[PDB]
Amino acid sequence: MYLTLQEWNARQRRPRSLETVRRWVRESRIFPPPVKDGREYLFHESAVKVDLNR
Amino acid sequence: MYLTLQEWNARQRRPRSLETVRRWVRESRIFPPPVKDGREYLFHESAVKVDLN
Amino acid sequence: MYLTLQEWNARQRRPRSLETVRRWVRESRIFPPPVKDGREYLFHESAVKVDLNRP
DNA sequence: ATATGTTGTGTTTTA
DNA sequence: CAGTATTATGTAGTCTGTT
DNA sequence: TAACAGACTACATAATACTGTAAAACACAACATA
């Protein structure tokens, strides 16, 4: 199933501002990369911001 | 699901300065280890300070 | 079955206004394109909104 | 006899 | 965050063709 | 017919694109002392 940008952001470790999450998408930080259905982004529910630590 | 560094520090017996708690993370003295999320660390609620060796 | 516009629209991930969906049909964005039966459009069950540009 | 707190500089990420 | 700009969708009104 | 689907035309709104600014959170270093 697919989420809105809002719905996806609400379900993360820590939700950020929508404006930030959009910048993430513009910057190809999210995989799979969402697709703009009309005027709004759809994330697949499996979609994640990619990262680095341990 | 997690706590921020502040949120975690606030529930410890002795809260310390932010630097000190960061030092601990740097030196792997928190288990389980926190995950970095953007610009801040997120702790497991139950993470403890641990000194090995 | 073939679906009405309304029924088609209702099965999509993000249902829109009927007017929007009609604008799509006029622009050929639905594949396969709907047929015309009397007054109304009727859609293939697997019909999907597609993007006919290649940016 | 060392962990902690304070002050300062700089980078990255967020709002 | 605030601010300006871009574009698809949303809404509303009128009109056209069909049953 | 009266009712309805839809075509069209105009405008309003929402989600985003982009730019610019401030600051949060942290890494690192130096130093002070309880």
Q: Are the CB atoms for B13 and B22 separated by under 8 Å?
A: no
Q: Find tokens 């007054």 and name the residue.
A: C39
Phi/psi of residue C44, nearest 5 degrees: -65, 150
**Six-digit token pair at A42?**
């759809």
Kindly report the number of other CB atoms within 10 A of residue B47's CB atom. Answer: 19
Superfamily designation of domain A1-54:
Excisionase (Xis) protein (1.10.1660.20)
Specify the CATH number of the domain B1-53.
1.10.1660.20
B5 Cβ contact partners less than 8 Å away, ≥ 6 residues apart: B18, B21, B22, B25, B34, B40, B41, B43
Q: Are the CB atoms for C5 and C21 separated by under 8 Å?
A: yes
| C-alpha distances out from residue B17 to A2, B10, B44, Å | 42, 10, 19
Rounded Cα distance, C30 and C43, in Å: 9
Query: Where do the structural domains in chain A lie, given as residue ranges?
Result: 1-54
Q: Are the CB atoms for A6 and A21 separated by under 8 Å?
A: no
**Six-digit token pair at B30?**
């928190």
Nearest CB partner across the interface for B1, out of A13, A51, A54 = A13
User: Class for domain C1-55, per CATH?
Assistant: mainly alpha
Kindly report the number of other CB atoms within 10 A of residue C15's CB atom. Answer: 13
Give chain A positions within 8 Å (CB) of B40: 14
Q: Which residues pair with A35 in a beta bridge?
A: A42
Rounded Cα distance, B8 and B35, in Å: 13
Q: Are the CB atoms for B8 and B47 separated by under 8 Å?
A: yes
Q: Find tokens 């009405």 and name the residue.
A: C4
Q: Are the CB atoms for A18 and A6 separated by under 8 Å?
A: yes
Q: Can you give the three-state secondary structure of chain A, one letter per residue? A: CEEEHHHHHHCCCCCCCHHHHHHHHHCCCEECCCEEECCEEEEECCCEECCCCC
In angstroms, the CA of A38 and the C1' of E7 are apart by 9
Distance from CA of residue C26 to its chain's centroid?
10
Q: Can you give the three-state secondary structure of chain C, one letter per residue? A: CCEEHHHHHHHCCCCCCHHHHHHHHHCCCEECCCEEECCEEEECCCCEECCCCCC
Return residues 27-46 of B near A (CB < 8 Å): 33, 35-38, 40, 42
In angstroms, the CA of B46 and the C1' of D4 are apart by 23
Phi/psi of residue A48, nearest 5 degrees: -140, 145
Phi/psi of residue A24, nearest 5 degrees: -60, -40
In strand F, the nucleotides that come within 7 Å of a protein beta carbon are 4-9, 14-19, 24-29
Task: Give which of C9, C14, C27, C50 to mutate to test A binding, by max A Cβ within 10 Å.
Answer: C14
Buried b (16+ CB within 10 A) or exposed e, A2-27: bbbbeebbeeeeeeeeeeebeebbee
In angstroms, the CA of C54 and the C1' of F4 are apart by 37
Residue A18: what residue type? L
